[PDB]
From Swiss-Prot:
The modification Phosphoserine is found at residues 1, 54, 61, 260, 406, 476. Interacts with FCGRT; this interaction regulates ALB homeostasis. Interacts with TASOR. In plasma, occurs in a covalently-linked complex with chromophore-bound alpha-1-microglobulin with molar ratio 1:2 and 1:1; this interaction does not prevent fatty acid binding to ALB. Its main location: secreted. It comes from Homo sapiens (Human). This is Albumin. GO terms for cellular component: blood microparticle; cytoplasm; endoplasmic reticulum; endoplasmic reticulum lumen; extracellular exosome; extracellular region; extracellular space; Golgi apparatus. It is linked to Hyperthyroxinemia, familial dysalbuminemic: A disorder characterized by abnormally elevated levels of total serum thyroxine (T4) in euthyroid patients. It is due to abnormal serum albumin that binds T4 with enhanced affinity. Keywords: Calcium, Cleavage on pair of basic residues, Copper, Disease variant, Disulfide bond, Glycation, Glycoprotein, Lipid-binding, Metal-binding, Methylation, Phosphoprotein, Repeat, Secreted, Signal, Zinc.
Amino acid sequence: SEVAHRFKDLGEENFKALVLIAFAQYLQQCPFEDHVKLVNEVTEFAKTCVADESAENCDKSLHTLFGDKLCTVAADCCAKQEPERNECFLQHKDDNPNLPRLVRPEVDVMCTAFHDNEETFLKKYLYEIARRHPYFYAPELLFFAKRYKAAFTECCQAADKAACLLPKLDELRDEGKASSAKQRLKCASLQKFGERAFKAWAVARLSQRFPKAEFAEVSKLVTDLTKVHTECCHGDLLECADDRADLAKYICENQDSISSKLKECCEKPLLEKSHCIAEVENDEMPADLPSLAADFVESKDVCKNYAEAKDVFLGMFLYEYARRHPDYSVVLLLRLAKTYETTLEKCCAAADPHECYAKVFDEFKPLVEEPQNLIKQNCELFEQLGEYKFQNALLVRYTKKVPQVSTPTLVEVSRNLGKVGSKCCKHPEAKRMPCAEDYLSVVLNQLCVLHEKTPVSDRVTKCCTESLVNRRPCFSALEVDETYVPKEFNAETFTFHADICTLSEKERQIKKQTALVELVKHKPKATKEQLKAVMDDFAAFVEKCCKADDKETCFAEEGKKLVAASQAA
């Protein structure tokens, strides 16, 4: 029995949690009650299997059971069987589910709901997150859950809860979105580029983090970590959680051989231990390390070793270059590794290989300076405009690049892209690139998966599928879509009402930003000069109309003077 197996390993509390997340991630539209019911029904059945490991259908695989339980409340997917049936659901997960924005009642109500029924109050949190983020890294979601419980348990019994809770919840909201983003990239890689791509990223990233570890050790870690994520992303949540625990034990047992910063981590609860390890800082770089050129460019055995085991050889190249360059982004290292390989492929077919591949590091110089200059420039620009204006500059740039993309998606993506300025520019040159470019990777991955749902821009498709590691330079190289046909104005699109006034300070900018997007789609060729000059106007429309007697019509009157002056510029 597979169900009994995992039940013992995870226990009842986690098992029930993981199954709920799984159901919430497959059927995101179904209500909380229905999942709660199915979970229990499933959970009890599991209990009968622990005892009689051959009772009803305890022999069946997880998918079969999970599939049959969901198929009692859904249709074509359920018509299929075992493999095809499961893949069916996986292809139907919605990255942008049409769910009602989530608003949180007053502090008083929450605490009451939490104190009254604790188990319910948390199952709903899980439920509401899992259905909105169908790819959220399950094991890590149980971590946020406990952290969420700790929030209420502490803040509901204080002087001013509003002051104690609201903040901690905001910190959880953001970090949860960050987490969801990083994981979405990991699944995309596995699913759209194959495990080989994922492994390389893991080699380089892990080699940067565990510099003292041996290639064979990293290789072992990478292999396991790969299976973990391969399972989570494919919906095998139980086994993913299982395998992720094992990996944590292993890393802790073998600390000394891996890293010296894993101490603090291994001295705490499971969920905290896993989370800790996955975010540990890079270990100090080993003192006396030979020069790379030695075994990789000067040696005369290059081509031969390359021939014998291309995979291990290139893997070793990556590990060696990555370990001594924590100042490089994972994508740069991988670009370097691709340059190296391409060079051996052509050079090892020449008369005198050595001569041909003797100056490979001169090919590296350009690749290393591009990111640096890009980052140096844009942070200077950021330092000058602030986050709001920078986001605007980004909205103008990205809409001109890929005008077909939906306004909701461009707004979302550009705002996030702007946050990279705030998150990374503060760091010194040394840690700027990892920060900047790996973050850009995450954010452009969102653009790519949202877009894939309804493709409308071949330029996006090409930049998203051509190469995982070159996505950023691909997009950065785009200027303005010269074949794009300007849109024709729509009264409704530029009609600002008083309902703006009730909206938060942010929900406003978001409105003004959405208008800037629409404007640029109408006037691609427009200039950053005119754009500004028009934005400030909109600012005026808001302050007036919003504070001028009983006027829900000023929105039509003040808005008329708006579009009028708008159609002029």
